[PDB]
RNA sequence: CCCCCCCUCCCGGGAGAGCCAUAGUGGUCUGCGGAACCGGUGAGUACACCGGAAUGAUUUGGGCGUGCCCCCGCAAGACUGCUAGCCGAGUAGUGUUGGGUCGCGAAAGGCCUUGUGGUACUGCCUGAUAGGGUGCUUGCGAGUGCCCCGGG
RNA sequence: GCGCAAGACGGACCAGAGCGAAAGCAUUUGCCAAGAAUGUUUUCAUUAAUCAAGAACGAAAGUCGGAGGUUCGAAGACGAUCAGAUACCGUCGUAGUUCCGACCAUAAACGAUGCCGACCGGCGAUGCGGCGGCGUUAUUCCCAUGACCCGCCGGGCAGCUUCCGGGAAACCAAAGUCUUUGGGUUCCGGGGGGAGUAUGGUUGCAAAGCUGAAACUUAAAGGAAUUUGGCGAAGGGCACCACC
């Protein structure tokens, strides 16, 4: 295209591009809250956790480290935090 | 590595000018780039530009118009006197009716005509016509 | 081009679009056709936006009616899909037709018997008719083309996004182009339907011709 | 790209534009200072401390919630290690490579990598000498690498 | 290791080992042509007539 | 007396996990008001004692992921699973590559309404009329046909 | 046809696929050390790029000292071929080819194209890592992992097209952004021979490696492309001044 407005693009183009090639750099990671079905302790787990985080009480394992995003165990429902 | 940010900025501006684009994205800004673009605005070669302020190093989006032939940067910053400016005028400009030399004087970044008007000289930056 | 309220695409035209298979295109997508595409779906078929097609058709109709000599518009179709359609278009609006075997040298070689020097050019396919496109470059002559989602855009000026593969859609574009040009010129009233039949512009295989001759009287 | 490799990488962290403390975080800077002191008493590097805090305790950075970084806090309290951690890791890797070459003399590629690692060690040690973190009489050698961990 | 020669030859007449390999390896990468291509014999014990007449009836 | 098969054609009856309706049910999702908002206590999933506080007197179900999760009453919707009388019963057995709340899947016997219509098909094996292999036909390429039985 | 012994090598799978700074690397398993890319809201904070002196690695052949020598095979012994054949061809065959320990530092070591950084068209695939989404399968339910399918992102070997642009052209998405000439930096060439030759220094046991002239002689030597012509070059046809 001969004329492209780079001052404000569409949001799906900002989502599509690399995290460093945007007009303003924004990370693709996020913070979230998980809870066990049995034990009731809401904790904060990073998306790319890269480590074994444990509940307060040491009963159930929350996540396993992977190459990218961490693998939450079955039954531990989650939702994204924002403000 | 990246050693001359202004030369890269004018190289990208000249490349997108030859390509025919209407907007140029300069990734690293500087105060020198802002003064150079302000001079090119005030002499009517580029349009209305922006500074994309992030917290590391800002980006600049330049609205282009079809009035620019070439933007160049002389490297390194050769010191030039008032009697040595005419040599640069004959071996750098395409004509005497137009063309400007941006030089870094102690009174600020300005063109050669204002440098002759304020009776001062400095170091070379670049040229545009 | 469609900015007025009388220049809106009416009820029957959308039905003709959906029955002629205009809204769906080919498999590949040209990068000049990013804006004339609504979205993609299953089995690799791109959806052409009908409103932008209407805007480009009105723009091409304005460009055609803008000149005052109707014989100075030359319309070329060399594929069998648009042989009779451009003939009916030239009979309707007064244009000059070329139907198959465009000889390389009409617009440039000045001593030929077929030396044509028009002012505006309409062609039905940018890809198969690459010979009038490069010949239109040597003279100051614009070009309006019926372009697909995969047709390359070079030396074109008004690109109407359509399905130029089926004969029904091609005949529908030529019929509405003649209709809109005659409506802008003033020969055809804007509110009374001058619609004779759209099938006079439609190409068919000859097997269907003997089939219709056997099934009819 | 890299310094001793022909490849080019673009894998690094990208901080958000907002440098403000989020409203959902309920940790006052003295509590995260206490947690940093506890993890340092457990014997961890500042990088691993930042990893554990970011993964478990929900903080983004210490520096966005406290006016100092992790190493600055550890130097203010007075329990930071006497050697930088990257130069220590490079010395440990060079010791492991030299231990590999004590029994395998046919591995020319490992000798090449040992030369590269020692060049990186000297290049970092020159900068740490000019920044006055290391004493001026410090010198990386073979026999000095065995006594140091 | 839990069979002697008779029923393992009976197992070698069809490709039951091949079908078991193809079924077991489906979760790793699916195979389609698995056949036991060669069976050799390294060591042979002392010759006993009774096993020969049990192997012929 | 051309005595053996074998292929096809007209029509009809059975077994099997097809589709469209029908009866019995079971789940996921959806909106409305918790007399109005800020904290302290014993683990806090629905929890209970209160202090502030709103209209002399009275008082509004919770958690901390501050915005959707529980428990309520109302209102009917969209989608899906099983059975083809129902209960026995998802019960043994079987199963894996890693788990689960787990697929496949019986009969004995008993209470009644004695058990809902149309439309097709079936080479052989494996693990369903699915899935994945692989044949018969004339040498090829493409079609028809290759479950059991009865009359010609 | 059944067995024994010796040494060498790892076909088919094997690709304009992978790794390594280059030379180079292909049976299975086990041990040790190392590395690119991807992911990161982790840490230090300018630690960076190119490089006289100096330093590691470095195909095959060649040298010194051992063990072993299956096949192949410089020198050599013959048999044909030919006017001659100490050549092509065939049979043997010594060093060498293999491993260990010590040497040289040479290739058309070629992408005949230095390294770092930025910008300028499109498309379909491919190897790795990550992300998202209808469906099929590891037999019918759920989740995650493998295997397919549709796309995005980053790095890498590459491909097709192009009046971007360049060039003497072949061609190149770099060999582009070059009279509109300046991003940073190392090495190197000034007509063809003499000549990588003489001499001096230096390294090596040796073969040889690095540095490296001058006298004299010459008007051309070369690069790309077009036309003819002739090929013991290929593909189609013809002729009793060609053949059967």
UniProtKB/Swiss-Prot annotation, chain A:
Zn(2+) binds at residues 36, 39, 55, 58. This is Small ribosomal subunit protein eS27. Its main location: cytoplasm. Signal peptide: none annotated. Belongs to the eukaryotic ribosomal protein eS27 family. Keywords: Cytoplasm, Metal-binding, Nucleus, Phosphoprotein, Ribonucleoprotein, Ribosomal protein, Zinc, Zinc-finger. GO terms for biological process: ribosomal small subunit biogenesis; rRNA processing; translation. The gene is RPS27.
From Swiss-Prot, chain B:
The modification N6-succinyllysine is found at residue 87. SUPFAM superfamilies: Ribosomal protein S8 (SSF56047). The keyword DNA damage does not apply. The keyword Transcription regulation does not apply. One of its GO terms (cellular component) is ribonucleoprotein complex. InterPro entries: Ribosomal_uS8, Ribosomal_uS8_CS, Ribosomal_uS8_sf. GO terms for biological process: translation. Coiled coil: none annotated. Belongs to the universal ribosomal protein uS8 family. Component of the small ribosomal subunit. Part of the small subunit (SSU) processome, first precursor of the small eukaryotic ribosomal subunit. During the assembly of the SSU processome in the nucleolus, many ribosome biogenesis factors, an RNA chaperone and ribosomal proteins associate with the nascent pre-rRNA and work in concert to generate RNA folding, modifications, rearrangements and cleavage as well as targeted degradation of pre-ribosomal RNA by the RNA exosome. Required for proper erythropoiesis. This is Small ribosomal subunit protein uS8. It comes from Oryctolagus cuniculus.
Swiss-Prot record, chain C:
The modification Phosphoserine is found at residue 42. There is a cross-link at residue 88 (Glycyl lysine isopeptide (Lys-Gly) (interchain with G-Cter in SUMO2)). The modification Phosphothreonine is found at residue 96. Acylated. Acylation may be a prerequisite for conversion of the monomeric 37 kDa laminin receptor precursor (37LRP) to the mature dimeric 67 kDa laminin receptor (67LR), and may provide a mechanism for membrane association. One of its GO terms (biological process) is ribosomal small subunit assembly. The record marks 114-115, 132-133 as: Cleavage. It is found in: Cell membrane; Cytoplasm; Nucleus. Monomer (37LRP) and homodimer (67LR). Component of the small ribosomal subunit. Mature ribosomes consist of a small (40S) and a large (60S) subunit. The 40S subunit contains about 33 different proteins and 1 molecule of RNA (18S). The 60S subunit contains about 49 different proteins and 3 molecules of RNA (28S, 5.8S and 5S). Interacts with RPS21. Interacts with several laminins including at least LAMB1. Interacts with MDK. The mature dimeric form interacts with PPP1R16B (via its fourth ankyrin repeat). Interacts with PPP1CA only in the presence of PPP1R16B. This protein appears to have acquired a second function as a laminin receptor specifically in the vertebrate lineage. This is Small ribosomal subunit protein uS2. It comes from Oryctolagus cuniculus (Rabbit). The chain holds residues 2 to 218 of 295 of the full protein.
From Swiss-Prot, chain D:
There is a cross-link at residue 42 (Glycyl lysine isopeptide (Lys-Gly) (interchain with G-Cter in SUMO2)). There is a cross-link at residue 26 (Glycyl lysine isopeptide (Lys-Gly) (interchain with G-Cter in ubiquitin)). The keyword Cytoplasm applies. SMART domains: Ribosomal_S13_N, Ribosomal_S15. SUPFAM superfamilies: S15/NS1 RNA-binding domain. Ubiquitinated at Lys-26 by RNF14 and RNF25 in response to ribosome collisions (ribosome stalling). Its main location: cytoplasm. The modification N6-acetyllysine is found at residue 26. Coiled coil: none annotated. Belongs to the universal ribosomal protein uS15 family. This is Small ribosomal subunit protein uS15. It comes from Oryctolagus cuniculus. The lineage of its organism: Eukaryota, Metazoa, Chordata, Craniata, Vertebrata.
């Amino acid at each position: 295209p001969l004329a492209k407005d780079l001052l404000h693009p569409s949001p799906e183009e900002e989502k599509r591009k690399h995290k460093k090639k945007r007009l303003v750099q924004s990370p693709n990671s996020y913070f979230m809250d998980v809870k066990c079905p049995g034990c009731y302790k809401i904790t904060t787990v990073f998306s790319h956790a890269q480590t074994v985080v444990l509940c307060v009480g040491c009963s159930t394992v929350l996540c396993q480290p992977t190459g990218g995003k961490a693998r939450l165990t079955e039954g531990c429902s989650f939702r994204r935090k924002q403000h | 590595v990246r050693m001359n940010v202004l030369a890269d900025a004018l190289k990208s501006i000249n490349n997108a000018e030859k390509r025919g684009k209407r907007q140029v994205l300069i990734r690293p800004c500087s105060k020198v780039i802002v003064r150079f673009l302000t001079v090119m605005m005030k002499h009517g070669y580029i349009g209305e530009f922006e500074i994309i302020d992030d917290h590391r190093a800002g980006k600049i989006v330049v609205n282009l118009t079809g009035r620019l032939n070439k933007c160049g940067v002389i490297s390194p910053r050769f010191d030039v006197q008032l009697k040595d400016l005419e040599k640069w005028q004959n071996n750098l400009l395409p004509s005497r009716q137009f063309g400007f030399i941006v030089l870094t004087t102690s009174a600020g970044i300005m063109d050669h005509e204002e440098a002759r008007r304020k009776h001062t000289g400095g170091k070379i930056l670049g040229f545009f016509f | 081009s469609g900015a007025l309220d009388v220049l809106q695409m009416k009820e029957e035209d959308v039905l003709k679009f959906l029955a002629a298979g205009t809204h769906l295109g080919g498999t590949n997508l040209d990068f000049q056709m990013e804006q004339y595409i609504y979205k993609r779906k299953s089995d690799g078929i791109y959806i052409i936006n009908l409103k932008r097609t209407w805007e480009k058709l009105l723009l091409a109709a304005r460009a055609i009616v803008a000149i005052e000599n109707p014989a100075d518009v030359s319309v070329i179709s060399s594929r069998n899909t648009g042989q009779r359609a451009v003939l009916k278009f030239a009979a309707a609006t007064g244009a000059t037709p070329i139907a198959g075997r465009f000889t390389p040298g009409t617009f440039t070689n000045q001593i030929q018997t077929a030396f044509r020097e028009p002012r505006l050019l309409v062609v039905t396919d940018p890809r198969a008719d690459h010979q009038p496109l490069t010949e239109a470059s040597y003279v100051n002559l614009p070009t309006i083309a019926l372009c697909n989602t995969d047709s390359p855009l070079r030396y074109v000026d008004i690109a109407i996004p359509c399905n130029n593969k089926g004969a029904h859609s091609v005949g529908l574009m030529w019929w509405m182009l003649a209709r809109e040009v005659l409506r802008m010129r003033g020969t055809i009233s804007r509110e009374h339907p001058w619609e004779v039949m759209p099938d006079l512009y439609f190409y068919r295989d000859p097997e269907e011709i003997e089939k219709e001759e056997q099934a009819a009287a | 790209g890299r310094m001793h490799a022909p490849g080019k990488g673009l894998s690094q962290s990208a901080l958000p534009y907002r440098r403000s403390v989020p409203t959902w975080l309920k940790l006052t800077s003295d509590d995260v200072k206490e947690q940093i002191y506890k993890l340092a008493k457990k014997g961890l590097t500042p990088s691993q401390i930042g990893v554990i805090l970011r993964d478990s305790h929900g903080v983004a950075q210490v520096r966005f919630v406290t006016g100092n970084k992790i190493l600055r806090i550890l130097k203010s309290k007075g329990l930071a290690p006497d050697l930088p951690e990257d130069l220590y890791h490079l010395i440990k890797k060079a010791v492991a490579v030299r231990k590999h070459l004590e029994r395998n003399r046919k591995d020319k590629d490992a000798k090449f990598r040992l030369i590269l690692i020692e060049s990186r060690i000297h290049r970092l040690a020159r900068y740490y000498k000019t920044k006055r973190v290391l004493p001026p009489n410090w010198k990386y050698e073979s026999s000095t690498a065995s006594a140091l961990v | 290791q839990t069979n002697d020669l008779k029923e393992v030859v009976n197992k070698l007449i069809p490709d039951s080992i091949g079908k078991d390999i193809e079924k077991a390896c489906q979760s790793i990468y699916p195979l389609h042509d698995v056949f036991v291509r060669k069976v050799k014999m390294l060591k042979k014990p002392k010759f006993e007539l009774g096993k020969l007449m049990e192997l012929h009836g």
